[PDB]
RNA sequence: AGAACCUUACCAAAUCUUGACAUCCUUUGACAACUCUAGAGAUAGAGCCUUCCCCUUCGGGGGACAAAGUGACAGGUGGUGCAUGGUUGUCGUCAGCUCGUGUCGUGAGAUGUUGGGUUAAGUCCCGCAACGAGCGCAACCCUUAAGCUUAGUUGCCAUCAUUAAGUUGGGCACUCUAAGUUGACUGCCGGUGACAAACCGGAGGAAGGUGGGGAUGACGUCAAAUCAUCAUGCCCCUUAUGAUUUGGGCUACACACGUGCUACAAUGGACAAUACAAAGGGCAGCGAAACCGCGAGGUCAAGCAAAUCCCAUAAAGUUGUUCUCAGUUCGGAUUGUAGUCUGCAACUCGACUACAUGAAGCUGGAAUCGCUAGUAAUCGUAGAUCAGCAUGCUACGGUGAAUACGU
């Protein structure tokens, strides 16, 4: 499980690359961003918690 | 002597009109409306604004502009023409605005939203 | 010889309300100050679905707006420089003072 | 139709069992677009034998399910069902004058 | 509901060439429809040279019909078209046989459909015939 | 659709942004530093019941301000708390602190507060709707435009799923000035989990 | 392809630096996706961890439509019954 | 919203057990860098330098530590989306959906919410044992179309002088630029209309009939979906149903389904010259020019946290030349050869460049899908996801029509 992957990316490397950035809060890997480091839906929720600004929203 | 002057404002396409008494005669960006805007055979259209106002004419012109295409680059010319013939005489308003070209179309293009793609065509439904 | 700034914060009337707040007292003890010369004030988009484990095409959109200001003030003195450094407040703005 | 079975191991036997039932339709008409079958293992602990079925049709189709204790009682029970749901459709029958 | 009316022709000071032009206009590529079809009145004026509207106007003349049908149980109604709808469905076949001829030039097809047509011949005069075959034949029942 | 909370529908316009600072794009370090704030704050939940803190990052300086409904408890008599956790909190955010607590008035009318009120009564093994029923009751006395609350899960430690919800005064949510305090909270005993969704109307 | 250029994983190298002076052996082990064939190699066996088992090879002359990464694709009959 | 390792959940082997990792109690401690040996690594065997740094009155307290013990425990991508919360699609952006009071009625229940008109709409007005209120639509907000003001750099050049070049001087006049203004509200009029509700028309106006779009999606149905977002009721495990390492695999193919992409050509293919955007990225990232090269790329290094500099040059098109209807210069899969970038590593399984080779295929059968105007259709552009990598997704523009009788 992910219990001990949790450390896998914050172990040390042999070299580089074999990494990821993750979530911090959820531990969801993919569908991430290097802005933040948070997943898809924490971003979600924490937008309507407005409590980065944050703007959200519908002006496109 | 003296020269009239106005904006113009189109498909992203934005223009200066200088209008100035003269022959009657274009370098847009300091070069010829013909060859600059492909083709093209269109500019009658261009000289309607003089067919139905001081009709026959002529004004000389000159214009900056940058933006968008020919289509609207070419059709961001009138506006700022026919708003510089109000400014040079409110009186062919009624010659005018009974045929158009003073009023600045407001419409231009769209956003997307979920469903299109490179063509823009919304997806099928599920046959068979 | 002049002094020049750059602001970034999320909000467009405390910014510039702010822009007056420096002004005043810089325009007190100075003068010659450019005025509040606006910037384009870009954006940005993030686009996250409505979902969890499915359901892509039904989605929502977000962004970030990015206001700059560009202020400008001439025949420097020191008295100026303690009017940039004395009132930014709210704290949003981003004040770079240069020169 | 995508024969999947959910906690259920579609066999030969099962595959077998059910186009053939669907041939008898030949009836009317076949005509044969497509057709799906959804079975399912839901336990309550009494715990099933799911059965949803779909049929698209001539320029329309009709769906069909039922539960029942097993698989073939579930085929079995849904048969009559999805038949009575295509029959009958049409004539209608002609005018106007004038 | 209004049907986004096209200015003046440009060309001759006709009108038709640009709700024509727009019809040979694919792609949304203008210039290369436009090429072609001034072209096409390059070569139909060249052949048994003649002004444009001889050809033009007397071929859709000898093809843009008057009666035209539609369905409604189904009994084929003959009915009187809006003159819109005739000079719409002329230049439809017009372009929509152009091509049908099968062959290579840009123009001579067009020309040749033009040619044809001033003279009553050509499968777009078929049209007109076997349309009001149609008419006629289906006044009984429907009418 | 199907629903969201307006606020994320209200922000932008009629509220500040739940937490401040300096606009650099320095926001993993300085987003996940202000989390582990919020983090901590659930050890004062259990003593404190506060509605929320909104942080301020001055030049070189932290502002938070608490919206308690216990003051006294958290400055304590004489503050033998608040300087322990400056220390405490500075321990962990390698950075100082200018905590001011900012205090609830009018005073137990919030969303929050009320919100895991109504889940502590009924974490205490109560028939739930009688809670909403005094709720509502002193809401409407405290004067409010309007509320409803509703509730999900397992009611009364019983079999499946369920709902309910009491609306009682005008809500007006639909529009985009109604500044109104959604809220929600999380509570079990022993039978899954039954959160809570309240809603109010006071003022535009 | 590589940055001018061939390479090894410098411990496999390293062992048969050790088999290949003296009298050879006609037996290797190894885990090999990271290194590949050239002329030193030569006259000894391998035997590369497909991902379940290793398998023998022997270096042969031109093995030079060949590598050592792979000599029996590890999808292994077929995947497919044609 | 990026499977070579990582990811990966799956498999092999090498592996460990208070464990991968976390807190507590006990023993200490600043916490270990560079190599050697073996190992495939994991890791060990060692050498070795981690070495109480704040406080200490002699000790201790203490941020943080070592390995061990310590039993709780840890952990479970083990199961249960029909034990649940949370979150979300759905019919449906449809026009409806309820209640307090009172009446009626044995009673369930109806009334309001019905009849007439009217609107896109429970929109309004009238009449009415009904009256009033709620949620819902509109409205409120964002964007867009016009103008006024505010201010002029990195933006503009109108008068100019001037540079290859708004390059310099100067001016903010213009466009531009971001915030408050005025504006369109059947508002003004005419008509039709139970005079009311309204509707038809006209004037002006930049915009006339909620200007266009965006957001917002009622009660609720689908025992809809998700225990693998997170959390969690219950069950189960616990030297393993946990956890570590090197490799494989998650991509195999006689085949089928969906979805997209590219061809089936002269409205065109090959080649030369030339005009036009929008948006947006950039810190050690954007790498200007120059230089090398058949090109992918390689060298160098100016500038620049951006109205600047760079990314980056638009394609369609326009001008011509040729090809002259072939399975063709259509076609562009196939396979090999030789190379560039990244990566420790491009064989199962990265992309791209140069050379060759040239498959099927001439508009697709029954059947079947979308779209009402800048729309369709077509040609480009950037962004994320990123070491590498999008026929996909999101966003931006360029060009740009046919039809809409009537129901």
């Given at each position: 499980?992910?219990?001990?992957?949790?450390?896998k990316?914050?172990?040390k490397?042999?070299?580089?690359?074999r990494?990821?950035?993750?979530?911090?809060?959820?531990?969801?890997?993919?569908?991430?961003?290097?802005?933040?480091?948070?997943c898809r839906?924490?971003?979600?929720?924490?937008?309507?918690?407005?409590?980065?600004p944050?703007?959200?929203?519908?002006?496109? | 002597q003296?020269?009239?002057?106005?904006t113009?404002r189109?498909?992203?396409?934005v223009?200066?009109?200088?209008?100035?008494?003269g022959?009657?005669?274009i370098?847009?960006n300091?070069?010829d409306?013909?060859?600059?805007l492909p083709?093209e055979?269109?500019?009658?259209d261009?000289?309607?604004?003089?067919?139905?106002?001081?009709?026959?004419?002529?004004?000389?012109?000159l214009?900056?502009?940058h933006?968008?295409?020919?289509?609207?680059?070419?059709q961001?010319?009138?506006?700022?023409?026919?708003?510089?013939?109000?400014?040079?005489?409110?009186?062919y308003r009624?010659?005018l605005?009974?045929a158009?070209?003073?009023?600045?179309?407001?419409?231009?293009?769209?956003?997307?939203?979920?469903?299109?793609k490179?063509?823009?065509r919304?997806?099928?439904?599920?046959?068979? | 010889?002049?002094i020049r700034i750059?602001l970034?914060?999320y909000?467009?009337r405390?910014?510039?309300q702010?822009?007056?707040?420096?002004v005043?007292?810089?325009?007190?003890?100075?003068?010659?100050?450019?005025?509040?010369?606006?910037?384009?004030?870009?954006?940005?988009?993030?686009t996250?679905?409505?979902?969890?484990?499915?359901?892509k095409?039904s989605?929502?959109?977000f962004?970030?707006?990015?206001?700059?200001?560009?202020?400008?003030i001439?025949?420097?003195?020191?008295?100026?420089?303690?009017?940039?450094?004395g009132?930014?407040?709210?704290?949003?703005?981003?004040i770079?003072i240069?020169? | 139709?995508?024969?999947?079975?959910?906690?259920?191991?579609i066999?030969?036997?099962?595959?077998?069992?059910?186009?053939?039932?669907?041939?008898?339709?030949?009836?009317?008409?076949?005509?044969?677009?497509?057709?799906?079958?959804?079975v399912?293992?839901?336990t309550?602990?009494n715990?099933?034998?799911?059965?949803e079925?779909t049929?698209?049709?001539?320029?329309?189709?009709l769906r069909?399910?039922?539960?029942?204790?097993?698989?073939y009682?579930?085929?079995?029970?849904?048969?009559?069902?999805?038949?009575r749901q295509?029959?009958?459709?049409?004539?209608?029958?002609?005018?106007?004058?004038? | 509901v209004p049907?986004?009316?096209?200015?003046?022709d440009?060309?001759?000071?006709?009108?038709?060439?640009?709700?024509?032009?727009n019809?040979?206009?694919?792609?949304?590529?203008?210039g290369?429809?436009?090429?072609?079809?001034?072209?096409?009145?390059?070569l139909?004026?060249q052949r048994?040279?003649?002004?444009?509207?001889?050809?033009?106007?007397?071929?859709?003349?000898?093809?843009?019909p008057?009666?035209?049908?539609?369905?409604?149980?189904?009994?084929?109604?003959?009915?009187?078209?809006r003159?819109?709808?005739?000079?719409?469905?002329?230049?439809?076949?017009?372009?929509?046989?152009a091509?049908?001829?099968?062959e290579?030039?840009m123009?001579?097809?067009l020309?040749?459909?033009?040619?044809?047509?001033?003279?009553?011949?050509?499968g777009a005069?078929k049209?007109?015939?076997?349309?009001?075959?149609?008419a006629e034949?289906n006044?009984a029942?429907?009418? | 659709?199907?629903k969201?909370?307006?606020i994320?529908?209200?922000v932008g316009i009629?509220?500040?942004?739940?937490a401040?600072?300096?606009?650099e794009?320095?926001?993993?370090?300085?987003?996940?530093?202000?989390?582990?704030?919020?983090k901590?704050?659930?050890?004062?939940?259990?003593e404190?019941?506060?509605?929320?803190?909104e942080?301020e990052?001055?030049?070189?300086?932290?502002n938070i301000?608490?919206?308690?409904?216990?003051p006294?408890?958290?400055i304590?008599?004489?503050?033998?708390?608040?300087?322990?956790?400056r220390?405490?909190?500075?321990?962990?955010?390698?950075?100082?602190?200018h905590?001011?607590?900012?205090?609830i008035?009018?005073?137990?009318?919030?969303?929050?507060?009320?919100?895991?009120?109504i889940?502590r009564?009924?974490?205490?093994?109560?028939?739930?709707r009688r809670?909403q029923?005094?709720?509502?009751?002193?809401?409407?006395?405290?004067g409010?435009?309007?509320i409803?609350?509703?509730?999900?899960?397992?009611?009364?430690?019983?079999?499946?799923?369920?709902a309910?919800?009491?609306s009682?005064?005008?809500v007006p949510?639909?529009?985009?000035?109604?500044?109104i305090?959604?809220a929600?909270?999380?509570?079990?005993?022993?039978?899954?989990?039954?959160?809570?969704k309240?809603?109010?109307?006071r003022?535009? | 392809?590589?940055?001018?250029?061939?390479?090894?994983?410098?411990?496999?190298?390293?062992?048969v630096?050790?088999?290949?002076?003296?009298?050879?052996?006609?037996?290797?082990?190894?885990?090999?996706?990271?290194?590949?064939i050239?002329?030193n190699?030569?006259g000894?066996?391998?035997?590369?961890?497909?991902?379940?088992?290793?398998?023998?090879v022997?270096?042969?002359?031109?093995?030079?439509?060949?590598?050592?990464?792979?000599?029996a694709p590890?999808?292994?009959?077929?995947?497919?019954?044609?």
């Open positions: 499980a992910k219990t001990s992957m949790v450390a990316q914050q172990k490397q042999k070299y580089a690359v990494e990821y950035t993750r979530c911090e809060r959820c531990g969801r890997p993919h569908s991430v961003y290097r802005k933040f480091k948070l839906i924490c971003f979600r929720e924490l937008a309507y918690k407005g409590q980065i944050g703007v959200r929203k519908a002006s496109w | 003296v020269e009239y002057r106005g113009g189109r498909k992203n396409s223009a200066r009109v200088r209008l100035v008494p022959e009657g005669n370098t847009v300091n070069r409306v013909r060859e600059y083709f055979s269109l500019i009658l261009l000289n309607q604004p003089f067919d139905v106002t001081e009709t026959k004419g002529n004004y000389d012109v214009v900056n502009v933006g968008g295409g020919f289509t609207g680059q070419a961001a010319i009138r506006h700022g023409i026919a708003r510089a013939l109000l400014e040079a005489d409110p009186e009624g010659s605005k009974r158009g070209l003073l009023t600045r179309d407001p419409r231009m293009k769209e956003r997307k939203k979920p469903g299109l490179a063509a823009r919304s997806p099928q439904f599920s046959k068979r | 010889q002049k750059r970034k914060a909000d467009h405390v910014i510039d702010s822009a007056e707040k420096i005043e007292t810089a325009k007190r003890s100075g003068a010659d100050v450019s005025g509040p010369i606006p910037l384009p004030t870009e954006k940005s988009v993030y996250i679905i409505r979902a969890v484990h499915m359901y095409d989605r929502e959109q962004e970030q707006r990015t206001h700059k200001r560009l202020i400008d001439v025949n420097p003195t020191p008295k100026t420089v303690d009017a940039l450094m009132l930014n407040l709210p704290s949003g703005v981003d770079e240069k020169l | 139709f995508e024969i999947h079975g959910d906690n259920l191991t066999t030969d036997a099962i595959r077998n069992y059910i186009e053939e039932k669907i041939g008898k339709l030949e009836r009317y008409f076949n005509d044969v677009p497509n057709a799906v079958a959804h399912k293992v839901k309550y602990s715990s099933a034998t799911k059965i079925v049929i698209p049709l001539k320029n329309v189709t069909a399910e039922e539960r029942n204790d097993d698989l009682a579930g085929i079995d029970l849904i048969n009559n069902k999805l038949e295509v029959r009958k459709y049409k004539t209608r029958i002609n005018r106007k004058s004038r | 049907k986004r009316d096209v200015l003046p440009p060309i001759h000071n006709s009108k038709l060439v640009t709700k024509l032009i019809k040979i206009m694919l792609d949304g590529k203008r290369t429809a436009q090429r072609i079809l001034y072209s096409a009145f390059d139909v004026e048994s040279g003649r002004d444009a509207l001889e050809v033009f106007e007397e071929a859709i003349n000898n093809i843009m008057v009666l035209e049908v539609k369905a409604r149980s189904n009994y084929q109604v003959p009915v009187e078209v003159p819109e709808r005739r000079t719409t469905l002329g230049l439809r076949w017009l372009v929509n046989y091509r049908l001829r099968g290579k030039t123009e001579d097809r020309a040749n459909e033009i040619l044809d047509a001033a003279n009553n011949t050509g005069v049209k007109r015939e076997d349309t009001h075959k149609m034949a006044k029942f429907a009418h | 659709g199907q969201i909370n307006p994320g529908l209200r009629i509220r500040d942004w739940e401040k600072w300096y606009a794009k320095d926001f993993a370090s300085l987003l996940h530093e202000d989390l582990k704030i919020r901590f704050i659930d050890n004062e939940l259990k404190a019941s506060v509605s929320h803190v942080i990052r001055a030049a070189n300086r932290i301000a608490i919206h308690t409904g216990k006294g408890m958290v304590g008599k004489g503050g033998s708390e608040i300087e322990k956790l220390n405490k909190l500075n321990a962990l955010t390698d950075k100082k602190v905590i001011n607590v900012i205090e008035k009018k005073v137990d009318l919030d969303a929050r507060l009320v919100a895991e009120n889940a009564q009924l974490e205490n093994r109560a028939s739930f809670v029923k005094q709720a509502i009751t002193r809401a409407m006395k405290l409010a435009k309007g409803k609350t509703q509730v999900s899960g397992r009611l009364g430690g019983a079999d499946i799923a369920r309910e919800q009491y009682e005064g005008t949510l639909h529009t985009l000035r109604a500044d305090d959604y929600h909270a999380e509570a079990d005993t022993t039978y899954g989990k039954l959160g809570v309240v809603w109010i109307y003022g535009e | 392809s590589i940055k001018k250029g061939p390479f090894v994983d410098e411990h496999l190298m390293k062992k630096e050790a088999q290949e002076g003296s009298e050879k052996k006609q037996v290797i082990k190894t885990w090999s996706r990271r290194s590949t050239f002329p190699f030569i000894h066996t391998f035997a590369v961890y497909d991902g379940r088992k290793h398998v023998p022997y270096v042969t002359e031109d093995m030079v439509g060949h590598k050592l990464g792979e000599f590890t999808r292994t009959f077929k995947g497919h019954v044609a």
